Structures are given as C-alpha cells and as structure tokens.
Amino acid sequence: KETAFVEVVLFESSPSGDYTTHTTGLTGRFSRAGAMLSAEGEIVQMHPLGLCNNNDEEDLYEYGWVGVVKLEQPELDPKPCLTVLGKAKRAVQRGATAVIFDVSENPEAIDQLNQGSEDPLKRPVVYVKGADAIKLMNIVNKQKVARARIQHL
C-alpha cells in the first residue's frame, strides 16, 4: 500500500529520568512523488509561506525534523512561490526527514501529490485529510513538543 500510519508522541520527563508518553494514531497516504520509506523526528509546524524564500531570514532547524504544513485555501495564495511538492523538496533541503501536508483546505493538491516524477524526493511526503488531519492538527496546535513516527504499513 500507499497508506501511511502516523503516530504522534507527546512526552514529559520525570525526576527519575524516565519518560511518560502519550501516543495518537492516524492515517494518511504517501505521495507517489516521494519515497515510500518510514521516517521519524521532532515535529516542526511550518506555514506554507515559510517554504518560500520570501521574508524570511527564516529559521534553522536541527537536521531530521518532520515538517507539518497545513495548505492554505488556494484563494489565499493564488501566486504560489513553489508547487506543493516543491515546498516539500525545500523542506528536505532545510533538513526535514519527512513532510506531512494537511490538504483539507486544498484537496485538489492531491492530484499533484499522486503524480509521478523522474526526480522524486528521496524522503517521504505524506498527505492527511478528514478526521486524520483533525487529529494531527489538534496535537500540533497544543503548546507542546511532539515527535512523529511515519510507518509504511
């Protein structure tokens, strides 16, 4: 399958040094234009405008982050700086191990994410929508650091 199982992990340390964790599961689909590989890392939420070399002097994240990007309604960004896959490629250049797109406000992006390339990304690009997107963004919009685990299967 092209199904991606995504686990989102919230964690707190204790004085003993042992962690308490809380996991939320959800499902998306791997883009055919990205790798069909598993990935894992700290979530970094980015506004889709942040993947433009606009303005900027933008943030350096430690290598290995999982980008979570909620697409805008296309009416709000009619002049996109890069294609949606281009923005994923840009994240990978900036150290992302994977990108998860919430495409619920731009479901037509799935057409581009389902279309193959002879220059595919070497890292996975997952899209979520529906209840799965709602589950993801509810956790990401909490104050807390979270880790994502993306599993092929």
Short mmCIF file of C-alpha atoms in Angstrom, two decimals:
data_model
loop_
_atom_site.label_atom_id
_atom_site.label_comp_id
_atom_site.label_asym_id
_atom_site.label_seq_id
_atom_site.Cartn_x
_atom_site.Cartn_y
_atom_site.Cartn_z
CA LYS A 1 0.00 0.00 0.00
CA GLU A 2 0.46 3.72 -0.24
CA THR A 3 -1.14 4.00 3.28
CA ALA A 4 0.97 5.81 5.88
CA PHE A 5 0.45 5.12 9.57
CA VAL A 6 1.36 8.16 11.58
CA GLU A 7 1.91 8.18 15.33
CA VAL A 8 2.22 11.46 17.17
CA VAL A 9 4.00 11.23 20.53
CA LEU A 10 3.76 13.76 23.33
CA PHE A 11 6.26 13.21 26.13
CA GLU A 12 7.19 14.55 29.55
CA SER A 13 10.27 13.69 31.59
CA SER A 14 10.18 12.90 35.27
CA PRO A 15 12.73 13.48 38.01
CA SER A 16 13.70 9.81 37.72
CA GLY A 17 14.68 10.38 34.09
CA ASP A 18 12.09 8.01 32.72
CA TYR A 19 9.62 9.46 30.20
CA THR A 20 5.84 9.49 30.26
CA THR A 21 4.43 9.36 26.71
CA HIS A 22 1.05 9.75 25.06
CA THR A 23 0.51 8.49 21.56
CA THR A 24 -2.16 9.42 18.95
CA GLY A 25 -2.56 7.32 15.80
CA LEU A 26 -3.84 8.48 12.41
CA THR A 27 -3.54 7.56 8.74
CA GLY A 28 -2.57 9.27 5.52
CA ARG A 29 -1.13 8.37 2.12
CA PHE A 30 2.40 8.52 0.76
CA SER A 31 2.79 10.80 -2.30
CA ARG A 32 3.91 8.87 -5.40
CA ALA A 33 6.40 11.68 -6.00
CA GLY A 34 8.19 10.95 -2.70
CA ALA A 35 9.92 7.98 -1.18
CA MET A 36 7.95 5.03 0.15
CA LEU A 37 10.11 4.96 3.30
CA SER A 38 9.45 5.24 7.01
CA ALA A 39 10.65 8.30 8.89
CA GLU A 40 10.73 9.76 12.38
CA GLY A 41 11.57 13.05 14.06
CA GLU A 42 10.53 16.09 16.02
CA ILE A 43 7.56 17.91 14.54
CA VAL A 44 8.12 21.38 13.20
CA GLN A 45 4.97 23.18 12.14
CA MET A 46 5.62 25.48 9.19
CA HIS A 47 3.30 27.87 7.50
CA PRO A 48 3.32 27.06 3.76
CA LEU A 49 4.61 30.64 3.09
CA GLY A 50 7.63 29.68 5.19
CA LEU A 51 8.89 27.38 2.47
CA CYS A 52 9.27 30.34 0.15
CA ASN A 53 12.46 32.34 0.13
CA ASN A 54 10.17 35.31 0.87
CA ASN A 55 10.68 37.13 4.18
CA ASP A 56 12.28 35.18 5.88
CA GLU A 57 15.84 35.21 7.20
CA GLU A 58 13.99 32.16 8.35
CA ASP A 59 14.70 29.57 10.96
CA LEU A 60 17.32 26.85 11.04
CA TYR A 61 16.02 23.59 12.46
CA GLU A 62 18.18 20.68 13.60
CA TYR A 63 18.55 18.03 10.90
CA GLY A 64 15.89 15.34 10.94
CA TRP A 65 12.64 17.23 11.57
CA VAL A 66 9.17 16.19 10.38
CA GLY A 67 7.51 19.16 8.76
CA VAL A 68 3.77 19.56 9.29
CA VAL A 69 2.33 22.03 6.77
CA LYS A 70 -1.36 22.92 6.50
CA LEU A 71 -2.07 24.17 2.99
CA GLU A 72 -3.99 27.38 2.59
CA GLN A 73 -7.13 27.67 0.57
CA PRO A 74 -5.83 28.37 -2.88
CA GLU A 75 -7.85 31.63 -2.96
CA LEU A 76 -5.44 32.97 -0.30
CA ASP A 77 -2.29 32.04 -2.28
CA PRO A 78 -3.08 32.38 -6.00
CA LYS A 79 0.55 33.15 -6.82
CA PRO A 80 2.36 30.28 -5.13
CA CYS A 81 6.14 30.63 -4.81
CA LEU A 82 6.65 26.89 -5.42
CA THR A 83 4.46 23.88 -6.16
CA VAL A 84 3.37 21.80 -3.15
CA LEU A 85 6.00 19.11 -3.95
CA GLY A 86 8.49 21.94 -4.47
CA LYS A 87 7.81 23.11 -0.95
CA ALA A 88 8.39 19.55 0.33
CA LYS A 89 11.72 19.48 -1.58
CA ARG A 90 12.62 22.80 0.01
CA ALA A 91 11.90 21.43 3.48
CA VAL A 92 14.15 18.45 2.77
CA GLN A 93 16.92 20.79 1.62
CA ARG A 94 16.48 22.55 5.01
CA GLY A 95 16.90 19.26 6.87
CA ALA A 96 13.41 17.68 7.04
CA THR A 97 13.29 13.92 7.19
CA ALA A 98 9.69 13.92 6.01
CA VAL A 99 6.83 16.26 5.25
CA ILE A 100 3.19 15.78 6.25
CA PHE A 101 0.71 18.02 4.41
CA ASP A 102 -2.79 18.63 5.76
CA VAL A 103 -4.54 19.09 2.43
CA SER A 104 -8.06 19.51 3.91
CA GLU A 105 -8.32 23.17 2.74
CA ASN A 106 -6.73 22.37 -0.64
CA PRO A 107 -7.83 18.88 -1.57
CA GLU A 108 -7.03 19.46 -5.20
CA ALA A 109 -3.32 19.30 -4.21
CA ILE A 110 -3.81 15.52 -4.05
CA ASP A 111 -3.77 15.50 -7.86
CA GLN A 112 -0.24 16.84 -7.91
CA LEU A 113 0.88 14.67 -4.94
CA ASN A 114 -0.42 11.48 -6.70
CA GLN A 115 1.53 12.26 -9.98
CA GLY A 116 4.88 10.54 -10.52
CA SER A 117 8.23 12.15 -11.26
CA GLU A 118 11.53 11.08 -12.72
CA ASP A 119 13.14 13.31 -9.97
CA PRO A 120 11.19 12.14 -6.89
CA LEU A 121 12.03 13.15 -3.37
CA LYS A 122 14.31 10.73 -1.56
CA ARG A 123 12.28 11.25 1.64
CA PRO A 124 8.59 10.57 2.26
CA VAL A 125 5.80 13.08 1.70
CA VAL A 126 2.53 12.13 3.38
CA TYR A 127 -0.84 13.79 3.00
CA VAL A 128 -3.66 13.73 5.52
CA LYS A 129 -7.23 14.99 5.39
CA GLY A 130 -10.55 14.36 7.13
CA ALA A 131 -10.55 13.08 10.66
CA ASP A 132 -6.86 12.17 10.37
CA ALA A 133 -5.89 15.79 9.69
CA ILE A 134 -8.09 16.96 12.51
CA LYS A 135 -6.32 14.55 14.87
CA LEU A 136 -2.89 15.71 13.75
CA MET A 137 -3.55 19.42 13.94
CA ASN A 138 -5.27 19.19 17.29
CA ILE A 139 -1.99 17.86 18.73
CA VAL A 140 0.35 20.11 16.78
CA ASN A 141 -1.65 23.21 17.87
CA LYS A 142 -1.07 22.38 21.52
CA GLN A 143 1.87 24.24 23.03
CA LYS A 144 3.90 21.02 23.35
CA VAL A 145 6.91 19.48 21.55
CA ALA A 146 5.78 16.30 19.74
CA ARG A 147 7.54 13.56 17.79
CA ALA A 148 6.18 12.00 14.66
CA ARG A 149 6.64 8.37 13.55
CA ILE A 150 5.69 7.60 9.98
CA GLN A 151 5.35 3.92 9.15
CA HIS A 152 4.86 2.31 5.78
CA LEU A 153 2.26 -0.33 6.81
#
